[PDB]
Amino acid sequence: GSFVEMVDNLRGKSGQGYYVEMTVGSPPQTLNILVDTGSSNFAVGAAPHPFLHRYYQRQLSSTYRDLRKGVYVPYTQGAWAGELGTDLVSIPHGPNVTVRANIAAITESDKFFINGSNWEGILGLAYAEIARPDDSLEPFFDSLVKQTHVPNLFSLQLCGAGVLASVGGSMIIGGIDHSLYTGSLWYTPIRREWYYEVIIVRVEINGQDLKMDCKEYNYDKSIVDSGTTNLRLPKKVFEAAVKSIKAASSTEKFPDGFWLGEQLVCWQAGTTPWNIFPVISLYLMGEVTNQSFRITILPQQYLRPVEDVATSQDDCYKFAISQSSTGTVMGAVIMEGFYVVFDRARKRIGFAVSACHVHDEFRTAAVEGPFVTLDMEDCGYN
Ligand SMILES: CC(=O)N[C@@H](Cc1cc(F)cc(F)c1)[C@H](O)CN[C@H]1C[C@H](C2CC2)Oc2ccc(CC(C)(C)C)cc21
């Protein structure tokens, strides 16, 4: 249908993920929930914690059912543990339905909730394969498609910055909202249904090819992850990219620690030298054999605005490309300014330029193709 009612249903603080409002339990208890395409568990704070403004109260819900088993979930650096159960859940600015869903009641955690955050739980939107304790714990979105009869698809339009900066965007559950993107939507295959795994076939920095065996770009996987902030790149790819961006931007010289994500670079306000930083093009495998298309990243996307309240007049930024030993993550920084369709029903992810994009006087983020290729299924790791 029209998805008018779901537009602008997402909020957030920069670097602390995007969240949607949800209700859990009878009568409904409202919580803000992190939207995470990089995990498969729906979990909510359900005991006091110094950084939680609210938490789920099982005893106040006539529909809670305890599953009498616990669950522990470690992420990249944060973790939680809790009791599993089920309860009735809905999304007030999503479709007007109620699903009985698995819920992990978080009763202890480590480096998970963030001070000042606004969210109280997390909604892992990926596949059952990566769910904890194991794949028999049906993820929230599988429940929603099974029980209500919504098409097996959602899309995400993460809009970036309009006190840390406020962000917003839209999560369209059950379809594609044509007013949230411009131009053509290009699909890449979901390689394997676990994370949302895709295949990158070529990387360019300022039109200049990185010239690596394309297997290195997906070593040992590449995923689309709304729950990670940065572009994360395997060791070798990272070093080659950081070299290419150093050279195209060599007129100014920056600390070791800038490029390690350890230190801000600051410029007197309004003096940010955008034009010395290159654009980055990631070509992704197409649906048609021997075709690819590319998405193009501006420096405005990979240099994250971050404020020092002291030197209060400057514009400061953190480098939001960073080194991985667990594969490529196309995180928030890559998804912002694009409209991303998690087409689960047809095992593909589409990209299109977003209605809320990040244009420059001279350069523009884009989604373009086709470009003819070969040995693209060779770019996958085994
Ligand atoms: C930053 C971060 O962790 N974000 C989380 C969500 C998240 C957001 C937050 F604000 C605080 C957190 F503690 C966790 C993502 O969900 C990470 N997604 C993938 C990225 C990457 C994959 C390997 C490429 O590495 C791992 C490692 C573990 C897990 C969790 C499960 C094992 C249970 C699936 C997920 C992932």
What gap in Å lies between CA 137 and CA 154, rounded to an integer?
20
> Is residue 330 within 8 Å of 317, Cβ to Cβ?
no
Q: Which residue's alpha carbon is at the smallest distance from atom 7 of ligand 1? A: 227
Identity (one letter) of the amino acid at 355? Answer: A
Kindly state whether residues 175 and 143 are assigned to the same domain: no
Amino acid at 145: V
> Which residues 6+ apart lie within 8 Å of 9 measured at CB?
20, 21, 91, 93, 94, 170, 171
User: What residues pair up with 22 in beta bridges, in sequence order?
Assistant: 31
Q: Is position 12 within any domain? A: no
Token pair of 1 as six digits: 């249908």
Nearest to 145 by CA among 103, 104, 99: 99
Q: For the range 172-177, what are the long-range contacts, defined as Cβ-Cβ under 8 Å and sequence gap of 24 or more?
A: 172/3, 172/6, 173/6, 173/91, 173/94, 173/95, 173/144, 174/3, 174/95, 174/150, 175/1, 175/3, 175/151, 176/341, 176/350, 177/2, 177/3, 177/6, 177/7
Which of 68, 74, 65 lies closest to 108 in space, CA to CA?
74
Is residue 344 a part of any domain in this protein? yes
Report the candidate in 280, 296, 189 with the shortest Cα–Cα distance to residue 243.
Answer: 280
Q: What are the residues whose beta carbons fall under 8 Å from the beta carbon of 373, sequence distance 6 or more?
A: 201, 202, 283, 285, 290, 291, 292
Claim to verify: residue 239 and residue 124 sit in the same structural domain: no
CA of 38 to the centre of ligand 1 (A): 6
DSSP conformation letters of 203-265: EEETTEE----GGGGGSS-EEE-TT--SEEEEHHHHHHHHHHHHHHTTTS---HHHHTTSS-E
CA-based torsion, 353, 355, 358, 364: positive or negative: positive
What span, in angstroms and rounded, lies between the C-alpha atoms of 296 and 274? 15
Experimental determination technique:
X-ray
Residue among 185, 182, 188 nearest 328 (CA): 188
Mutate which of 35, 44, 49, 75 to test ligand 1's pocket (most atoms within 8 Å of Cβ)?
A: 75
- How far out from the chain centre does Cα 331 lie? 4
Q: Give me the phi and psi of 12, to 5 degrees please.
A: 165, 165
Q: Are residues 282 and 349 in the same domain?
A: yes
Q: Which of 93, 123, 150 is the last residue of a domain?
A: 150
Q: How many domains does the chain have?
A: 2
**CA dist., res. 140 & res. 54, Å (int):** 21
Are the C-beta atoms of 196 and 223 separated by less than 8 Å?
Answer: yes
> Could you tell me the CA-to-CA distances from 351 to 9, 33, 91, 188, 242 in Å, in that order?
20, 24, 24, 8, 25
Name the residue at shortest CA distance from atom 30 of ligand 1.
75
Cα first-last separation, the chain: 41
**Region of residue 151 (phi > 0: left; psi between -120 and 50: alpha; otherwise: beta):** beta
Look at residue 162 and tell me if it is in a domain.
Answer: yes
Q: Is 25 a domain residue? A: yes
Answer whether residue 9 is part of any domain: no
**How is the beta sheet containing 222-224 ordered, strand by strand?**
222-224, 328-330, 231-234, 321-324
146 plus 42 within the same structural domain: yes
Q: Tell me which residues are annotated as active site.
A: 36, 225
Q: How far apart are CA 26 and CA 90, in angstroms?
A: 11
Asked if residue 329 lies in contact with residue 230, where contact means CB atoms within 8 angstroms, the answer is yes
**Run of H or E residues at 332:** helix 332-335
Please check whether residue 116 lies inside any domain of the structure: yes
Residues 262 and 176 in one domain: yes
Selection from 160, 155, 154, 221 nearest residue 365 by Cα: 160
Q: After which residues is the chain broken (C to N over 2.5 A)?
A: 162
Indicate the resolution in Å.
Answer: 2.3
Contact indicator for 236, 281 with CB cutoff of 8 Å: no
Q: Provide the residue range defining the domain that includes 342.
A: 151-382
Classified as helix, coil or strand, 6 is helix
Q: What whole-number distance in Å separates Cα of residue 104 and Cα of residue 116?
A: 22
Residue list, ligand 1 pocket, CB within 6 Å: 17, 34, 36, 38-39, 73, 75-76, 78, 112, 130, 132, 195, 223, 225, 227-228, 326-327, 329
Measured from the Cα of 41, ligand 1's closest atom is 33
Domain with residue 122: its CATH number is 2.40.70.10
